[PDB]
Amino acid sequence: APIPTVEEKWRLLPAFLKVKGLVKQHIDSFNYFINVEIKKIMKANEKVTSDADPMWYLKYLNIYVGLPDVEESFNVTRPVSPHECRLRDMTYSAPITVDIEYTRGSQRIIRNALPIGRMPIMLRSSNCVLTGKTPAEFAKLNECPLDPGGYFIVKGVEKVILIQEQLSKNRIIVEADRKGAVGASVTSSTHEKKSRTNMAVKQGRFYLRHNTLSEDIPIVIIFKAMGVESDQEIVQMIGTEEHVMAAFGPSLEECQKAQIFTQMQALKYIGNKVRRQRMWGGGPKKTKIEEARELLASTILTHVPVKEFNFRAKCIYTAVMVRRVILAQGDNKVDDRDYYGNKRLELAGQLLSLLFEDLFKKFNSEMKKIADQVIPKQRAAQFDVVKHMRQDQITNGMVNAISTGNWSLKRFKMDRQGVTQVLSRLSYISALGMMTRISSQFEKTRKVSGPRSLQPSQWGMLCPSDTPEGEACGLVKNLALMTHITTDMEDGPIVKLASNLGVEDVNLLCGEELSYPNVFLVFLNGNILGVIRDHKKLVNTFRLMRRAGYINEFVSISTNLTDRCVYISSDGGRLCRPYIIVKKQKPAVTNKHMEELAQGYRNFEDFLHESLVEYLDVNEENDCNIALYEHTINKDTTHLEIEPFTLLGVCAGLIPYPHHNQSPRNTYQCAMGKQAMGTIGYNQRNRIDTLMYLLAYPQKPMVKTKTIELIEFEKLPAGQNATVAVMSYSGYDIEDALVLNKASLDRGFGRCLVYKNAKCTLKRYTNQTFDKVMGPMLDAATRKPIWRHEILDADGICSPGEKVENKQVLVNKSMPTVTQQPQYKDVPITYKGATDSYIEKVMISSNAEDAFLIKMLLRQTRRPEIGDKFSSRHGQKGVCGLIVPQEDMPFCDSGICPDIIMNPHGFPSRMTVGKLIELLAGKAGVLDGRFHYGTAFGGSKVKDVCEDLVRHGYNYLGKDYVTSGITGEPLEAYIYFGPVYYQKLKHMVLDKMHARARGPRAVLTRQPTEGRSRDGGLRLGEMERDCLIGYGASMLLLERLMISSDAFEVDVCGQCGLLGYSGWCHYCKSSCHVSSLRIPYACKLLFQELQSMNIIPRLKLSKYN
Amino acid sequence: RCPDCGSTELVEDSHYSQSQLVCSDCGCVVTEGV
Amino acid sequence: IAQLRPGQEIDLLMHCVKGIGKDHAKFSPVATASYRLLPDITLLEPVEGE
Amino acid sequence: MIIPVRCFTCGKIVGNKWEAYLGLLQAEYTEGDALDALGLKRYCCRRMLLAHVDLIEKLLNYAPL
Amino acid sequence: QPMIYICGECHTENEIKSRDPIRCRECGYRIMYKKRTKRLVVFDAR
Amino acid sequence: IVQDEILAHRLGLIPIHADPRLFEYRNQGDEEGTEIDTLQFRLQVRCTRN
RNA sequence: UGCUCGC
Ligand SMILES: Nc1nc2c(ncn2[C@@H]2O[C@H](COP(=O)(O)OP(=O)(O)OP(=O)(O)O)[C@@H](O)[C@H]2O)c(=O)[nH]1
Ligand SMILES: Nc1ncnc2c1ncn2[C@@H]1O[C@H](COP(=O)(O)OP(=O)(O)OP(=O)(O)O)C[C@H]1O
């Protein structure tokens, strides 16, 4: 009697994608920032006033962001589309205005609409013009309907703010030190200050270390300073276990060694260990004990609040910390940093909120300074802020922080880099996967190899296979297909329900109750909420109340029996995943609910409200029991997995049958699909980017995953299905190589288009002179333009439709040299290119600064050849080794010749059975006119495709009788034929081909330049020099590193040993001992630099004999 | 002027990433390298 | 060949010359020209029944 | 973008059988029976017509016109 | 010499001379493309 | 909207019903073409609203 | 300088 299974259960996934999913995270975060958080920030700094001239103030009333507009028109705004901002190389922002009231001459003056800045508008947000639009209206705005959005457009470039990952704040971390000492650390972070205080056991006793103390002091002294003076109460608070007292004995003995027995003595001892913050302004007037008490109340353990100098909660907190350290000092139960239950994810919303708060505080400080400087000495003409409210401050700050990507917040002392990254437009999959990226706080510079591991906590939250292969392996990750990031809650009803549920106040009882085995501590965001007995009832009631709707569904509750702590988490950034609730071996979701969802009676919110599906956090799912399938449900099951294939991310979803392949193969496939060539969107023709790759005849895959249908990848494919035959042919496919068919490439297979952009600017300078474009310099001999100016039109700008060759001008730009007649020198935009290019379009735009921006879109049509890199959607990257004619290709009985011949030897070492399954499913599908599914942990089975093959008259294993095309005789072994979805990569041999003549050299060191765009040469590295040394080729090494790279002839004086010039020594004022000498130029530079460093190298020359 | 033939047909023609001012009549390389 | 919209125009002349399929596949006259060996299935023993 | 004229593997003329195929999609014919009625015996032309996406009209929707 | 351009939304032939603010009649769009050349261009079917 | 190179490639794949035996191979070069060894096809389509 | 990549 098998348990009934809901077949339509997977239908819960698309509905969840209707309100949440891939791109909704950043959109919702930006909307919450621009609709709620900005108002709170404005309210926090609503009033600003100066100390001088009292009764003067500047009061903010309400702030608005409005709709995106452009300041091109003279003092007039105009609606502008994001594509127009991309074309004009401007920013897509909306004017931040605010209504205010102030006092000019003690008379209240109010302004109802006064702009103060410009906020860059995230695409597809609440205020973005793209939202609430139909695909026809998207076409009217030249924007792709399938574009994910959620990225900023600044100065014409698309920047994406990656999701930041960090450790959770206000949490005790027990960890071993460098010397093996198991200590504790707590980074108490409030809205104002973040302070990491540590506790060590370096000498069998516990010392507390903080940045505000000169030397670490015993914990018992701090206990005595915080109100509790009796040692018995301290011991009761620490614990009543015999081993606990045995471990804490040395601390009590060390405390009794000194004469510290009262609160005053301990406070004086602490103040003696307090150092002033470099002569703080103001008379101290015996603040030692006061400074100590203030550091204990405010600086130390900021997250633990003291009502009115009552350190009872702080005492209980540090006692629990000491108890945890004592318990961890035995059995090595050291907490791990890689546990994602202690991780927090900051979206663009929180970062933008912090940045806007910092910018507004800086603006208010600048306004207060201007007031203090202007009001008391200017004139009877009353000063008003309106004449000094600079509007470029916030705008420039936002633009720079978004574009450059470096964020420096002095108010929070946060110096971050790489926050924003250029959106990759290689393909639709590339942008869709980059939109859901997550960077690590480790900020890779070294081999940590501790967060780079794949932790089991990433289940359902982050994609295990999707990771950049290279130095960033493991520290750059991707979110799962079905995941959600929580926001901040009010935390009020949580406290109310906890107090009403029997949680005893910690101030009512002593710390001895903390040592009882049945008493469980309840926390709240790192704050000790209290104690409780029979925590099972508490947890069950809290979960039932959350399911009922009286508590927010994102509030998480977990229990740690080892530490006996009930954690209640309500802060934002936590990862949650929907799960079907299971009660008494039967899921709450039935077939009737799925039928109602399919018919439209209910949505995912109805499933959430009816206690059917609930969100689980990592900490909460740590205590819950989840079943993968219905048949796995047992008596002790609390939740059911919605869909297993949701474990993979977006890029991993393209893999057909990924569970049949190896994990490095899946990782390489994700990495190559991020670089897969194909269509970008429906507006890819009007789009003008610096580099674009398009496919001539893209085709949707035959074996498509359900994730492909969810992300609508089939509407924008990035590859072609080719009849691949797995066999060895001509020995030109030895290692990963593949043989292509000449006739196939001749008929359009693999044909690709490369679009490049050439931009030029004609700007007006300070002087009343402008850059002007001269006409084509016609040759008087033939009355026709010269070969260089052949493609130019009458206006000096190259016209679309013609072909451009190497060293030809596109824009005949001439710029003045003055900034009396203006003198113009020519700086034309020449086209550097090995092959010819065709001009598709030329866009001419005009900015507010009268600068004409001209963009030419050059197009190149390229055919697959030897050297082009090809992928097969399974990590089997390959290079075209040989292009054989059609007649040389083997043929079957039906006469089909394969397009791509791949080596079978790549299969055994990599075990890519998924490729064979995909080939078989695709063959069956193209035979019966169907699209088989390669869904992870499912999909079409092998038996079904075998039956489909045997029904159509083909072999049930793909292997078919094939006759050799060369000899005309049949092969002894059958060949594995079938359609495989091969995708071409951006790595081309034409772009990677490089050859270096003498060429240019660098000014500092006369050596070839670095890159290919700079016409650089290849570098003989240190290891190459080592190899040449090992070979013993002295003359070859000398010719390479001296003769051919930086050879020079200097003049050295044989008397003083210094370097001369033109056969003359200025030091000795003679030229008889000066002799020429061959030398590397870098060596002469080193000698000169050493002479500059007073390290004078004196060369004693001699004859070569 | 060209140092060999004395002609004034000195053209700046870059040959495979090598800036070179060369005479257009006799092909004498006047200046090379930048 | 292609699909157009109002305003767009396609004007061109095409010069066609003689060529063989070896140079380019566009000169291939046959779509599928193949040959197969004639099968001859033989029964070693008389098979009857279902 | 647009339906290719020649099949990649064999080379049978397939560009002229696209719109009629769409007609067979406008009719009650499924994929397999329509591909059979069009005369595509080998599976290469079936894959060519079935896996092709018609992106030309989506681009013409963004054309200047 | 009449230099002709095409607007981004009206798609009308507009004649503007040098040093003119880039605009188009009966609208306000500021994206101005250049018309295709009239010179003969030879292409290879390869 | 179709690219010029893609348009030329699609036009090249279009077969011609001309008898090849009645023509000859074009000599090396000679892009102008002669009556014997070339054929010309004019394609002029202007799309407009009905 | 930064960063995404290619092995
Ligand atoms: N922020 C930034 N810094 C740069 C950039 N290019 C170079 N630098 C800085 O300059 C140093 C390297 O200089 P180079 O790249 O050798 O400068 P260069 O290419 O010789 O300059 P040119 O002679 O003008 O080509 C680095 O330490 C960088 O900090 C850039 O594009 N942005
Ligand atoms: N950081 C690097 N330093 C030196 N060589 C590198 C580096 N990254 C890549 N390579 C080059 O690439 C090669 C690495 O390939 P290898 O690791 O042997 O196969 P693989 O990448 O594991 O492929 P599979 O995943 O096994 O299919 C060897 C090396 O010459």
Ligand SMILES: [Mg+2]
């Ligand atoms: Mg390699």
Ligand SMILES: [Zn+2]
């Ligand atoms: Zn000397």
Ligand SMILES: [Zn+2]
């Ligand atoms: Zn075919």
Ligand SMILES: [Zn+2]
């Ligand atoms: Zn217009």
